[PDB]
Design a protein around this nucleic acid. Sequence first.
DNA 1: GCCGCAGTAC
DNA 2: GCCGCAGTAC
Lengths: 283, 284
Amino acid sequence: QRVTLTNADKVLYPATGTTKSDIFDYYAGVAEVMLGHIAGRPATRKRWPNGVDQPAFFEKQLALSAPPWLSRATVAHRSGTTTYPIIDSATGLAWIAQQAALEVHVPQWRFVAEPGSGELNPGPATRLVFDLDPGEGVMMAQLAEVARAVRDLLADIGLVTFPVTSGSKGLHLYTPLDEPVSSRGATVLAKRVAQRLEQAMPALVTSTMTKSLRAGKVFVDWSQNSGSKTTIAPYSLRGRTHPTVAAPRTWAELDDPALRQLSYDEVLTRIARDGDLLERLDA
Amino acid sequence: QRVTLTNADKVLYPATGTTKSDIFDYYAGVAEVMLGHIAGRPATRKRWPNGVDQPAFFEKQLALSAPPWLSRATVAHRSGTTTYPIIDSATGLAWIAQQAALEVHVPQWRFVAEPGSGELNPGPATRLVFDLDPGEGVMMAQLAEVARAVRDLLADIGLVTFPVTSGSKGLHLYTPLDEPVSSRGATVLAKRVAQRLEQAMPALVTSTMTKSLRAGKVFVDWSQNSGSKTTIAPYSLRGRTHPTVAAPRTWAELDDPALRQLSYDEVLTRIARDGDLLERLDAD
DNA sequence: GCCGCAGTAC
DNA sequence: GCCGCAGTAC
């Protein structure tokens, strides 16, 4: 119900002196605007128990010693079943904080309660996600040009798109689906989009991961809309040198030549001032 | 040089009762027709020492115990360094046979001696491969039809194409590049073909891997043209229930609604009649 | 002290 | 008898 934060004031990002208490407050701070974008969704963690200079690990399976109040659901998986935790409460974030789970990864679908059994099973996709990964020697304007064009192609079928600077290198774009659709269809559509863009912008865009083909291109990754993939949640910290955030931005911001990744402190100032840019993303 | 056959007449394919001796003879049998298409290339092995009902493993790195007379070359693999065997003699396939390396996998480029060095490093692609992979529910007619469409596109840019039934489920197509192109360009080229094909045959053809999109469609895999990938060598045996083979075929055969995979004995007698159907492919 | 703690493709 | 025996992505 509450999480007892141990190892407080212990540094996680050595380069900025960011403490485990700093993390706790951050997630408490962005709890309001972050929750609606991850509730209902299985939450993949990446964990740096011993700081950002120390070995990390990905974790999907939830520990059987993990708190009993954490909402949970399982997914039949190739090799075995996986029981995921759903983070859906300021209390859930506090756990993320103490678990040292700097990053929170979710897919673009939620669980749905079954008719008779009421079982929590994987539901349709409620939003699309695109991952724009600037390759060898790609500058901000080209990356933004590409991002605007993706927005254009989605605008062309009456959809709206929201820019999220991942805190890493990639720009993530999300589009809410007012009528949800299977993961497969959502992947058909993100793929059509990618491909179409790659057609119209051969020298500036690739729709494929093939690394040899990336130099000088923005890889428009449409595949993470796969039912079985994951994307770093908005408002989530990263595990890098500095403590940067998958921070929601405005389209005007992208027109900035010197545009940069946003820090946790900056994100907070901007929430209190304006609120959730992604508010319309999960009504 | 020399290779002692071990545990001859021990079974590897239980379903057919195929022994190491058979495997030994088979590779001996296809030596002449197979070598040209793997010589110069790093050989990845999939080995089933305890036959085809028991765990296998992918092997790339060459054991220190391996015969000194075997050809070698090293590729830098970012995580570390691998030095593969190159198969280039009848006695090399004897060793393969002996290793129980049922399958041989090569990429579409050969090694080339560096000027001052003589150090064998990876050179450009000498042939394009398409891997036509049938998704759930895809029947014979469709695999064949899509192959014929690829051939068409390829002939539309001055290239010929040879069909090989993979020994499994897939159908592979090779194209000579009498003038070698970087793996980067071969991949670019392959991807364009596949995307053009998919654009024109959306209901029947996909160009991406995504499993959830694969069903009912032929995945024209254009991406085994990367230099860091591998495709089963032609004439190679299969780690399958029955000892099927990556067998070169004729376009006419691909008209047959009951086209199936061929087994090694069928391949053998087929060579005797025709010789190598892929001769055009690796004129060195 | 350890160790494991993901997925699923080619 | 047990073990390893692949590399590369998202």
